[PDB]
Amino acid sequence: KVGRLIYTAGGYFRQSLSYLEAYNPSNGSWLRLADLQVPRSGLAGCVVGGLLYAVGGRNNSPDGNTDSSALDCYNPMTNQWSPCASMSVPRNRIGVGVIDGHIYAVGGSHGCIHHSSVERYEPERDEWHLVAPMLTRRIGVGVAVLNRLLYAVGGFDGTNRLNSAECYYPERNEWRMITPMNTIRSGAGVCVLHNCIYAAGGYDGQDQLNSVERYDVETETWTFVAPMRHHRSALGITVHQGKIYVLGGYDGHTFLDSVECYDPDSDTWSEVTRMTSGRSGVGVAVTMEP
Ligand SMILES: COc1cccc(S(=O)(=O)N(CC(=O)O)c2cccc(-n3ncc(C(=O)O)c3[C@H]3C[C@@H]3c3ccccc3)c2)c1
């Protein structure tokens, strides 16, 4: 369990970014690691087998906006990125989750197209295949996995921001609606802690949010917990040693460098570190130090 870092990849400030940086909660240090081969914002990060994956996004640059179908793999042992097989379609503002060593890519946008499609990556075979699509088109969708079920939360369907959510049951290759959130959220951070799916922040169509609510998969209720100190949309999120960490985002005025940490035992947030520069739309995941 020792030696794990919080990795943040890509993001946005003025343009899409190629940064890969890793925070050590044990000593407060940040490390700058190998840049992404292509700058990307609106991507998602995940880890399988100790390897860090960067999935989808968009390269917003002065000379273009290119939505990404890319899957790239970072090995901390080598400090090198390697391309993997690309997805069927570009997916900006994507959500991803891992079930039993397989990466699920959910939703996202391609130009004005809002995807309901979903595809699954097999790392050993380096292949993507489409699975059943969601019941709703969703970009800026939050995704997390609990008890080998995959949850897609909120987002934007092309017309409305959403409080709805749904769950994918792999053995039936089927999606079902779950209880909707209390709050409309696009671009929230979604993660799993204990027996709940948490949705932190986002944009409700009017303001960036500091509220946080959690879905109890047993009781099927959404309950608010303590709000974050900072309102933020397009934040990064992960869980580490029983606590939630939120990284960066946009508060309506500033691209935040703030990293906050939620303690579920006390139901409190605290500010634990700052990123090296403010940014939004990062991918985040946890694995061993390089
Ligand atoms: C002012 O500049 C910025 C401020 C913050 C972030 C960024 S971003 O570069 O990181 N980026 C932006 C990109 O992909 O082009 C991005 C990435 C992931 C999630 C979201 N996100 N969060 C809420 C909503 C919403 O409006 O419902 C959306 C975004 C998708 C939805 C949207 C966009 C346009 C019109 C309607 C709806 C955005 C830029």
Swiss-Prot record:
Knockout or disruption consequences: Early postnatal lethality caused by abnormal cornification. Mice survive until weaning and probably die from malnutrition resulting from hyperkeratosis in the esophagus and forestomach that cause gastric obstruction. Defects are caused by constitutive activation Nfe2l2/Nrf2, leading to constitutive expression of phase 2 detoxifying enzymes. Mice lacking both Nfe2l2/Nrf2 and Keap1 reverse the hyperkeratosis phenotype and are healthy and viable in normal conditions.
Cellular localisation: Cytoplasm; Nucleus
Recorded superkingdom: Eukaryota
Post-translational modification: Non-enzymatic covalent modifications of reactive cysteines by electrophile metabolites inactivate the BCR(KEAP1) complex. Accumulation of fumarate promotes the formation of cysteine S-succination (S-(2-succinyl)cysteine), leading to inactivate the BCR(KEAP1) complex and promote NFE2L2/NRF2 nuclear accumulation and activation. Nitric oxide-dependent 8-Nitro-cGMP formation promotes cysteine guanylation (S-cGMP-cysteine), leading to NFE2L2/NRF2 nuclear accumulation and activation.
Any coiled-coil regions, as ranges: none
Result after altering residue 233 to A: Impaired interaction with SQSTM1/p62
Site residues, Sensor for electrophilic agents: 112
Each Kelch repeat, start to end: 5-50, 51-101, 102-148, 149-195, 197-242, 243-289
Effect of residue 41 to A: Impaired interaction with SQSTM1/p62
Modified residues (S-cGMP-cysteine): 112
Subunit structure: Component of the BCR(KEAP1) E3 ubiquitin ligase complex, at least composed of 2 molecules of CUL3, 2 molecules of KEAP1, and RBX1. Interacts with NFE2L2/NRF2; the interaction is direct. Forms a ternary complex with NFE2L2/NRF2 and PGAM5. Interacts with (phosphorylated) SQSTM1/p62; the interaction is direct and inactivates the BCR(KEAP1) complex by sequestering it in inclusion bodies, promoting its degradation. Interacts with NFE2L1. Interacts with BPTF and PTMA. Interacts with MAP1LC3B. Interacts indirectly with ENC1. Interacts with SESN1 and SESN2. Interacts with HSP90AA1 and HSP90AB1.
Notes on the domains: The Kelch repeats mediate interaction with NFE2L2/NRF2, BPTF and PGAM5. KEAP1 contains reactive cysteine residues that act as sensors for endogenously produced and exogenously encountered small molecules, which react with sulfhydryl groups and modify the cysteine sensors, leading to impair ability of the BCR(KEAP1) complex to ubiquitinate target proteins.
Function as written in the Swiss-Prot or TrEMBL entry: Substrate-specific adapter of a BCR (BTB-CUL3-RBX1) E3 ubiquitin ligase complex that regulates the response to oxidative stress by targeting NFE2L2/NRF2 for ubiquitination. KEAP1 acts as a key sensor of oxidative and electrophilic stress: in normal conditions, the BCR(KEAP1) complex mediates ubiquitination and degradation of NFE2L2/NRF2, a transcription factor regulating expression of many cytoprotective genes.
Family that this chain belongs to: Belongs to the KEAP1 family.
Protein name per UniProt: Kelch-like ECH-associated protein 1
The species this protein was found in: Mus musculus (Mouse)
Taxon lineage: Eukaryota, Metazoa, Chordata, Craniata, Vertebrata
Boundaries of the shown chain within the full protein: 323 to 612 of 624
